[PDB]
Design an enzyme around this catalytic site. Structure first.
Site, PDB file in Angstrom:
ATOM      1  CE  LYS D  90       4.935   9.465   1.736  1.00 33.61           C
ATOM      2  NZ  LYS D  90       3.868   8.511   2.130  1.00 33.61           N
ATOM      3  CE  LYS D 126      -2.842   3.257  -1.653  1.00 32.63           C
ATOM      4  NZ  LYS D 126      -3.636   3.720  -0.493  1.00 32.63           N
TER       5      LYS D 126
HETATM    6  N1  LIG Z   1      -2.837   6.217   1.105  1.00 32.01           N
HETATM    7  C1  LIG Z   1      -3.300   7.594   1.172  1.00 32.01           C
HETATM    8  C2  LIG Z   1      -2.151   8.507   1.556  1.00 32.01           C
HETATM    9  C3  LIG Z   1      -0.843   8.018   0.997  1.00 32.01           C
HETATM   10  C4  LIG Z   1       0.345   8.731   1.592  1.00 32.01           C
HETATM   11  O1  LIG Z   1       0.172   9.447   2.608  1.00 32.01           O
HETATM   12  O2  LIG Z   1       1.462   8.555   1.049  1.00 32.01           O
HETATM   13  C5  LIG Z   1      -3.886   8.016  -0.166  1.00 32.01           C
HETATM   14  O3  LIG Z   1      -4.674   7.275  -0.761  1.00 32.01           O
HETATM   15  O4  LIG Z   1      -3.569   9.096  -0.680  1.00 32.01           O
END
Ligand SMILES: N[C@@H](CCC(=O)O)C(=O)O
Ligand SMILES: NC(=O)C1=CN([C@@H]2O[C@H](COP(=O)(O)OP(=O)(O)OC[C@H]3O[C@@H](n4cnc5c(N)ncnc54)[C@H](OP(=O)(O)O)[C@@H]3O)[C@@H](O)[C@H]2O)C=CC1
Ligand SMILES: NC(=O)C1=CN([C@@H]2O[C@H](COP(=O)(O)OP(=O)(O)OC[C@H]3O[C@@H](n4cnc5c(N)ncnc54)[C@H](OP(=O)(O)O)[C@@H]3O)[C@@H](O)[C@H]2O)C=CC1
Ligand SMILES: NC(=O)C1=CN([C@@H]2O[C@H](COP(=O)(O)OP(=O)(O)OC[C@H]3O[C@@H](n4cnc5c(N)ncnc54)[C@H](OP(=O)(O)O)[C@@H]3O)[C@@H](O)[C@H]2O)C=CC1
Ligand SMILES: Nc1nc2c(ncn2[C@@H]2O[C@H](COP(=O)(O)OP(=O)(O)OP(=O)(O)O)[C@@H](O)[C@H]2O)c(=O)[nH]1
Ligand SMILES: Nc1nc2c(ncn2[C@@H]2O[C@H](COP(=O)(O)OP(=O)(O)OP(=O)(O)O)[C@@H](O)[C@H]2O)c(=O)[nH]1
Ligand SMILES: Nc1nc2c(ncn2[C@@H]2O[C@H](COP(=O)(O)OP(=O)(O)OP(=O)(O)O)[C@@H](O)[C@H]2O)c(=O)[nH]1
Ligand SMILES: Nc1nc2c(ncn2[C@@H]2O[C@H](COP(=O)(O)OP(=O)(O)OP(=O)(O)O)[C@@H](O)[C@H]2O)c(=O)[nH]1
Ligand SMILES: N[C@@H](CCC(=O)O)C(=O)O
Ligand SMILES: N[C@@H](CCC(=O)O)C(=O)O
Ligand SMILES: N[C@@H](CCC(=O)O)C(=O)O
Ligand SMILES: [Zn+2]
Ligand SMILES: [Zn+2]
Ligand SMILES: [Zn+2]
Ligand SMILES: [Zn+2]
Ligand SMILES: [Zn+2]
Ligand SMILES: [Zn+2]
Ligand SMILES: [Zn+2]
Ligand SMILES: [Zn+2]
Lengths: 495, 501, 495, 210
Positions: D90, D126
């Site tokens: 995620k 990411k």
């Molecule tokens: N990219 C956001 C959210 C990631 C997500 O919602 O999976 C973070 O830094 O947590």
């Protein structure tokens, strides 16, 4: 039928759509905040609206069957999917000779708008096989159902996450059982959701409670919500409530009979029932259970004792509520003038044509549109699909826990009431109402089907009613419905 | 598209089949040794054929595309699959406004039988997208043909072991290229045969030698094998050879231009060429290159300097061989009487109506049937598929071996001779002839495509002659081609022990 | 191994099944709607039953292992899948040298009827590998169970929707974690439910609260549900409840230990523990937490400070409850005459032979049967499979909302009361009791595991009792269970 | 993005990680009850943290985009999958010219730990696309986010059971609506949970309140 008002089913529902499409047109336009404004929006709107209307995929089958006698006969069939704006597609399989690519197309579309009215997240779809089942043995009907499932499976027109079919005219538990069985025995041997591939199943095979009688029950809930609304009951010139009402029912099938059952149950008098060979009648009342008994016994409603044989369009019977629960295009401009009923409850799929719709409005007959009334079907089919997906009978894991908690909650009100009224109160037993005692372990499957259907059919009845009053459609309930089906679908296509 | 002889394409072709199903019915029955003898013999024949006739599956699509100016437009298209008695299904994608479900069903059935005639193991299919490609940008066409490939891919109507498309009217390499890429980039990203998912591809994207030209090359052989069957040149009132002969062709896209090149090459004079906006004419001849050149620059053949713009239907031009190579239903009962030609080579797909068909038969005009003549296309498509399945170009691994082996074979002839004829003979140099020197590394790809096509059109032509003579069909070449098709496809449904139960 | 009453395990279990069938044969026949009345009603029934008895599939395996010492070893193994009337099949993996195809077959058949008894939607299946786990390394036991997983994967004998294995004898959390990984490493790499391919997993690896403990915790519940029915303790000749009671346990593994834990927790005195190298015994009590520490520290029970090495069949120890929690066919025609206990709680799988069942019957000895008693397993296995499917820990999203809901709920009773009783009450606080304080946020995961299990066992306890009485089986609890398992699997068999 | 205090982003999070791991290393060894205790536990703890720190999978993409002027531009892009200790992975998608495999590796490692803090059952991941979205048209952006997705799906770097993305800087609802759509439309037409292949989606396309 009807030879002077037999519009092409697809274009007809296309009509209903277009209509509702126009009254929202300004609303949808002003909603969308697109920067490129003025009328690039208005095109954007009928641009999106022009993709909604047509079906995305339609699959035509010709496959052979070996009949019982040993000959080879070729069976044709179709399945149309109208939308993927919600995955998977949902819709029944009907076995009649009227089946054409076109009626399968219109049916499918109808299913899309239907699920929108009723907040079920499915795109519409529908199949048909061009056979009169009556003319085939049970063994043949099986072969036809299986091979037709294999064809739909290979070309991707069935599957729990693609396209969940379901029942319709001349199909029931039995067939869905075969569908679910040949799917899950071939293509689905690995799918943890192989039995979520179809709905309407035997409860013993993945079905849910009251899915047979669910579209009938939803018919009732749909009628009730309006018949108990003084605003429309003034305008209509009739008493609120079911107590004084008399109704007739075209078709004695899954939605025919059970519509009779629930309406008869809450006080409406069923004076007449019709089938494809005739009607019967008795303004002192027909009992569904006796009639059902006689029908299962003698394969025909005709010659039923406690009711005479009624010569003539049962659609034109004197009654409060007219409930088409057979095939489409039965109340037309031909026989719309002389209908007699003040409320049309479209249990069947697209049973009154737009020409009739017109007469009915300026006649001030109220049409509860199939769009909203017979969604009790998918709504429970949506429940059945959800049951399969979750792999639990609703309640199983929480019954005892909820039972115990409510008990300790109840106990806390007690121990607190006694903590204050020491002994002038005494011992104050806090006990569940007989009805809260039925509701004490939490909702069982049954409870979810019954209540979830009721919530659905009213939440949707309200926003239909609210949209009728916001645009002054008065009694054109269908047009408010599509206005809501469109609005919800359009929201997907642009956002 | 005529009017007072505009029969339903699919049912029309059913008729061509039905006619041949009746010539064979007694033979199929006789052959079938089902113990259950008598007439439940015949009925099972009658019953099988009733299962061959309809398409098995037909997929209709509506999908939107974002047109270049931002508008949304809803595109419709279809693809039908006639038969699986051989897999995959094979058949082309056609972009016209004529594209209807019923058209695509007829074309499909026509492709099943077409493959039976020429022993190409494919069931029949065919798609159409209902657009006028002349009305969209190259960008919109790309968008549209990929989405179609997507929409076909998802419901099982494209795939190398399932259903291999191909070019038809207003599609070609360019579209096949997009179709192969979009397929191989999604559903096929792990298929070792992702690119066998369609034929007609560019050579450089999996295509094979002369696929563009091969339908016309096939037209050529197919005319040659009959125009030199003295038997038939007798009844027709003509002379064997292409030598003096004269011809006109309807259409100048893939099938017209190349039938025209190939007949021109082996001596026939091309006197007229039609396209949709009109025709051009010259009894001294039109040169296929100059015409092609003129067309590639100007967008039409009208105005070609070395020819007059003909007024009137090219199908009526006085010639020996009329080549319908455009859309279907061009030769109807209205215009069949007036054809002036004595051989009609049906390069196109279903260009002759059955009513027109009777007229030519009655007029003693020999119609080489679509079934047989334009099968050049599949046969090389079939080679392109084989080419993709084998992931080698032909010869690549045996060239140097063949060369060496031949040289050493010939040396054995030599050394053996020299041993016999000690010195009264001397040294007896055994060398490849000039032509055997070309054939000395064994077949290149192009060799196979050429010789294999030739073999197929010769073999199937004699099969068609043998059958027409056995059943005294004379010049009813079409049904003879159908009697062969049926015999073959029937053989498959029959020997299957059953088919299902 | 008894040298004069060692029926083939599969046939032996077929006998239990045969037994129960002839009891409900008349029942299944009469319900069966079939138009084709008569005895072609009876014969379809018996044909269907003739389908249910044999296992649908059996995979026999030979795969080589290269031992730690670098030599080559051919490991044989089996998985039988008995029924697919519910997918996936469920059932444990066993490591023993007893594992034969016929033993595996019997255990699998025992699984389908077992889940039928406790309404766990799984066909039954079972695998063994013919190894002495004591004779292999951790490394060798990993190569083995990993390669076995691969053999099972590639032929469709493991998968979250096809067949979900779990622990059994000489397998546990550590083996389940390997299975789960090996599966999810390879085949299931894209499967969103790869980790639901097996149950018994460690909690950090998708396991569920108290699944090690689940089975004996159900042994406790199942005993409890019977030890508290006066009708059965009368017939027996014993006092209700665990208060005065005394039990011996053959087996100190995952079933024996926690059975012994929980029974001990609620009163009963454990007086004998036994394993395969002997038994200990002490009439005044064996504390389970003591025996665990000693076992864990010494790899045996023999010579446990607080008991004597018992010499003589633990199956013949003097006690109220005998708990076989080891292998099958322990209680046989030779020693059933000498058993001395009044309640035999079959935590094991098929511990009692049919000839010994007969002796027990006429000796008025209540054997609570495996079929029901040890189904605490699958039930909590079921719970974890669902846990894995639902990808959320129970309660995570609702705790805070339920807390505030109940506080406002009580706060509603408070203010309503104060509105009535102005100052004659004054301030009428309404608070949770201590017990409702614990439930005031909704069910945690363990909440569900604990109450779900308990619910399942009491409900299944009842429908066995209900069946026994209606069939005048008395203490033949086993035939009552099979009768429910046969009833339930049948009726899935509708086309 | 500074001057003389600009540490390698990934190592900067490794720095944080390594710090909080000595605080527990004692606790972890004391926890683990392995029969071969000793420092053969201290080190099997040392080994385990050594596997957690480095991303398990990084995928560097170069893929072409036809710009709106017709020209071809090779657009750069990465998604790092830090841990599978819970599947699916995620983490968001970032559209910036600061995007590098190390930045995206770091944000990835930051995301597993972020999900451990709040007990969200996902290993971290990411993604970044080295572009500056003010320089691109919506149509270009769409062309990019889709082609990026098709590359992610075929290599197993997006998928509801394998890896689920989300928004980030210069991405949001719109690009989430694109990813969802190109995956569901191509790689997962049969996948019942196709639209669970990415979060942050518009309410109407499967997203959630707030
Ligand atoms: N990219 C956001 C959210 C990631 C997500 O919602 O999976 C973070 O830094 O947590
Ligand atoms: N879940 C569902 O089943 C849902 C169904 N619908 C619609 O409900 C309608 C009926 O469904 P269902 O009741 O399941 O179909 P069934 O096969 O269950 O029974 C249909 C009944 O209608 C009768 N009938 C059909 N056409 C005529 C006619 N022209 N004149 C008189 N009687 C007729 C048949 O009589 P005979 O048996 O003599 O032919 C039969 O008794 C269909 O249009 C369906 O699309 C809508 C929502 C959900
Ligand atoms: N592999 C193949 O390509 C094969 C094709 N065929 C059949 O041959 C026919 C054409 O194939 P192909 O040549 O590929 O299609 P093309 O797209 O190559 O165009 C063929 C020609 O037909 C012309 N044309 C179309 N309609 C008419 C008309 N009504 N009157 C006169 N000329 C017309 C077009 O002119 P304009 O551009 O002005 O419309 C064009 O020059 C089709 O029936 C096809 O099925 C047969 C065997 C194999
Ligand atoms: N979830 C589960 O684990 C379930 C298990 N069962 C059944 O319960 C029984 C065992 O379960 P489990 O506890 O998991 O098995 P275990 O591997 O946990 O070991 C069980 C115990 O039985 C003892 N034992 C084995 N063979 C004999 C023997 N011939 N004589 C005496 N003692 C013996 C073992 O001692 P030693 O170490 O000396 O062998 C050990 O103490 C089996 O029948 C199994 O199918 C039932 C339901 C579910
Ligand atoms: N054909 C027929 N169906 C019935 C009859 N009674 C109930 N059903 C339907 O069959 C299913 C089983 O009925 P029940 O178990 O009593 O459930 P129910 O929800 O209480 O029944 P209803 O409220 O009447 O719908 C329900 O879906 C009923 O709607 C009946 O007499 N005849
Ligand atoms: N459209 C078109 N095609 C051509 C022309 N010349 C050759 N071709 C085709 O393009 C392919 C390459 O030509 P060649 O390399 O000469 O192959 P070939 O087999 O020797 O060509 P031919 O025998 O003339 O068919 C072959 O399919 C030719 O049919 C031409 O002038 N116009
Ligand atoms: N093998 C073994 N298991 C234990 C022991 N103590 C507790 N357990 C089990 O390990 C699990 C974790 O224990 P807890 O977190 O305390 O949960 P619990 O629901 O209160 O467990 P119970 O004590 O059985 O009520 C539960 O299944 C316990 O039954 C033990 O001493 N040995
Ligand atoms: N950017 C922005 N977001 C808003 C605004 N008003 C509401 N939202 C967001 O829109 C979503 C739906 O908002 P509401 O319909 O007002 O309901 P809500 O849950 O009360 O949202 P909150 O106002 O944040 O508590 C929530 O994510 C809000 O944060 C606003 O004025 N600007
Ligand atoms: N075919 C039914 C719904 C069937 C279903 O999807 O469950 C209808 O028209 O409403
Ligand atoms: N349209 C061509 C296509 C042949 C092919 O390449 O499959 C035909 O009708 O023969
Ligand atoms: N072997 C176990 C299997 C339990 C499970 O499926 O977890 C039993 O007999 O019930
Ligand atoms: Zn098929
Ligand atoms: Zn109900
Ligand atoms: Zn589509
Ligand atoms: Zn060539
Ligand atoms: Zn193997
Ligand atoms: Zn617990
Ligand atoms: Zn790539
Ligand atoms: Zn909010």
């Amino acid at each position: 039928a009807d030879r002077e008002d037999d519009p092409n089913f697809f274009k007809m529902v296309e009509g209903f759509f277009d209509r509702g499409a126009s009254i929202v047109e300004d609303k949808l336009v002003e909603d969308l905040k697109t920067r490129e404004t003025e009328e690039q929006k208005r095109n954007r709107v009928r641009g999106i609206l022009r993709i909604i209307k047509p079906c995305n995929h339609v699959l035509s089958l010709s496959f052979p069957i070996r009949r019982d006698d040993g000959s080879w006969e070729v069976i044709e069939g179709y399945r149309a999917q109208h939308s993927q704006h919600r995955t998977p597609c949902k819709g029944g399989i009907r076995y009649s000779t009227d089946v054409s690519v076109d009626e399968v197309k219109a049916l499918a579309s109808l299913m899309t708008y239907k699920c929108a009215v009723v907040d079920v997240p499915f795109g519409g779809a529908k199949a048909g096989v061009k056979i009169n089942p009556k003319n085939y043995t049970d063994n043949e009907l099986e072969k036809i159902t299986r091979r037709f499932t294999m064809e739909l499976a290979k070309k991707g027109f069935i599957g729990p996450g693609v396209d969940v079919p379901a029942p319709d005219m001349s199909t029931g538990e039995r067939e869905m059982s075969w569908i679910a069985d040949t799917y899950a025995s071939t293509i689905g041997h690995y799918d943890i959701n192989a039995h979520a591939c179809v709905t309407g199943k035997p409860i013993s095979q993945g079905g849910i409670h009251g899915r047979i009688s669910a579209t009938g029950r939803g018919v009732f809930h749909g009628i009730e919500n309006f018949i108990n609304e003084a605003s429309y009951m003034s305008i209509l010139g009739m008493t609120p409530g079911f107590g004084d009402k008399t109704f007739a029912v075209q078709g004695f099938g899954n939605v025919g009979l059970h519509s009779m059952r629930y309406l008869h149950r809450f006080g409406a008098k069923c004076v007449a029932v019709g089938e494809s060979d005739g009607s019967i009648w008795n303004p002192d009342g027909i009992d569904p259970k006796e009639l059902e008994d006689f029908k299962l016994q003698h394969g025909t409603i005709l010659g039923f004792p406690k009711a005479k044989i009624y010569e003539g369009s049962i659609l034109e019977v004197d009654c409060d509520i007219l409930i088409p629960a057979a095939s489409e295009k039965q109340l037309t401009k031909s026989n719309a003038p002389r209908v007699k009923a003040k409320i049309i409850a479209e249990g069947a799929n697209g049973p009154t044509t737009p020409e009739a719709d017109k007469i009915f409005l300026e006649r001030n007959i109220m049409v509860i549109p199939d769009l909203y009334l017979n969604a009790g079907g998918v709504t429970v089919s949506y429940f059945e699909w959800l049951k399969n997906l979750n792999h639990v009978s609703y309640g199983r894991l929480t019954f005892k826990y909820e039972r115990d908690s409510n008990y300790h909650l109840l106990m806390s009100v007690q121990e607190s009431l006694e903590r204050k009224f020491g002994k002038h109160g005494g011992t104050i037993p806090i006990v569940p109402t007989a009805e809260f005692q039925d509701r004490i372990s939490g909702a069982s499957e049954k409870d979810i089907v019954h209540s979830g259907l009721a919530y659905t059919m009213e939440r949707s009845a309200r926003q239909i009613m609210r949209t009728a009053m916001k645009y002054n459609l008065g009694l054109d309930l269908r047009t408010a419905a599509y206005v809501n089906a469109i609005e919800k679908v359009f929201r997907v296509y642009n956002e």
